[PDB]
Amino acid sequence: MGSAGLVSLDLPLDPLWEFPRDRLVLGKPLGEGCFGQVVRAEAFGMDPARPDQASTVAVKMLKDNASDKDLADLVSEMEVMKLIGRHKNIINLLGVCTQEGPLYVIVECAAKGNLREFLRARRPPLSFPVLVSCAYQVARGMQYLESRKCIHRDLAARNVLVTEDNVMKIADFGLARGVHHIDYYKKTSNGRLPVKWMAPEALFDRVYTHQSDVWSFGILLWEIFTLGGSPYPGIPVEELFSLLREGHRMDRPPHCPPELYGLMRECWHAAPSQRPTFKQLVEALDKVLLAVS
């Protein structure tokens, strides 16, 4: 501004999404990375009727040491989450604070952490109905993301969050273009390319599609029925590329229903046109819920 000689440029006001900053009471941290954090908060008057009613939310924000690149990435994520629309099995945007302060991106709260940590903590609770429901819910989330033309490009157990009522919420679906995104939760994190989740065409040709997300869902299924196991255990990256190029895939986990491994194999087809759609995976997993009960 020429009038004031202001020190910083402002983000544009979207009245539909703007939430009052005074109504957001910040509590304890859900996570903290080096350049970003996620704070638990109580949002008063989140819905039109029932003012002064507190609802618990997660507030995603950058720390002071973050760059303008990092802000552009968070803003890009915000704008994708504005367009995606509401669904039970994805982390939805609840509100934003863009004016007269730092950017807050208010999203749904998932108290039990990611799906990998959830499953690893419950190792001898996790019966077959619960595990098939986790797979089903993620499948339904991905079905919705496909219908709204959203490719995830990094589907894994570590990016599926879990609520207090064991609802699976897919996270990180609308990240910005690139590979070097900041971590919001922990100070030391894996920055590397998630090679063991990526489809061959995504690995070698860098072609990301809905079909390559289906490959990743197959590895997430393998993660679920190994109870948060690490894929391709003790296989180096050079050996992995060689192995995948021969047509080889991971073995069926112990005590895994044959039908579920059948779905993994079809997800792991070399030719992406032969892989099943998320609608087919939802329908197939629905049948397993009825049989397993």
From Swiss-Prot:
Question: Which residues does the entry assign to the active site, renumbered to this chain?
Answer: D154 (proton acceptor)
Disease connection: FGFR4 variants may be involved in the pathogenesis of various cancers. It has been found in prostate cancer as well as cancers of the breast, colon, head and neck, larynx, lung, skin.
Q: Which residues carry this modification: Phosphotyrosine?
A: Y184, Y185
- Top-rank lineage group of the source organism: Eukaryota
Q: Where is the Protein kinase domain?
A: 24-293
Functional description taken from the UniProt entry: Tyrosine-protein kinase that acts as a cell-surface receptor for fibroblast growth factors and plays a role in the regulation of cell proliferation, differentiation and migration, and in regulation of lipid metabolism, bile acid biosynthesis, glucose uptake, vitamin D metabolism and phosphate homeostasis. Required for normal down-regulation of the expression of CYP7A1, the rate-limiting enzyme in bile acid synthesis, in response to FGF19. Phosphorylates PLCG1 and FRS2. Ligand binding leads to the activation of several signaling cascades.
Impact when changing P254T: In a lung adenocarcinoma sample; somatic mutation
Q: Which residues of the full protein are shown?
A: 447 to 751 of 802
Q: In which tissues is it expressed?
A: Expressed in gastrointestinal epithelial cells, pancreas, and gastric and pancreatic cancer cell lines.
Name the UniProt record assigns to this protein: Fibroblast growth factor receptor 4
State the family named in the UniProt similarity comment for this chain: Belongs to the protein kinase superfamily. Tyr protein kinase family. Fibroblast growth factor receptor subfamily.
- Report what the Swiss-Prot or TrEMBL entry states about this protein's PTMs: N-glycosylated. Full maturation of the glycan chains in the Golgi is essential for high affinity interaction with FGF19.
State where the protein is found: Cell membrane; Endosome; Endoplasmic reticulum
Assembly, in brief, is: Monomer. Homodimer after ligand binding. Interacts with FGF1, FGF2, FGF4, FGF6, FGF8, FGF9, FGF16, FGF17, FGF18, FGF19, FGF21 and FGF23 (in vitro). Binding affinity for FGF family members is enhanced by interactions between FGFs and heparan sulfate proteoglycans. Interacts with KLB; this strongly increases the affinity for FGF19 and FGF23. Affinity for FGF19 is strongly increased by KLB and sulfated glycosaminoglycans.
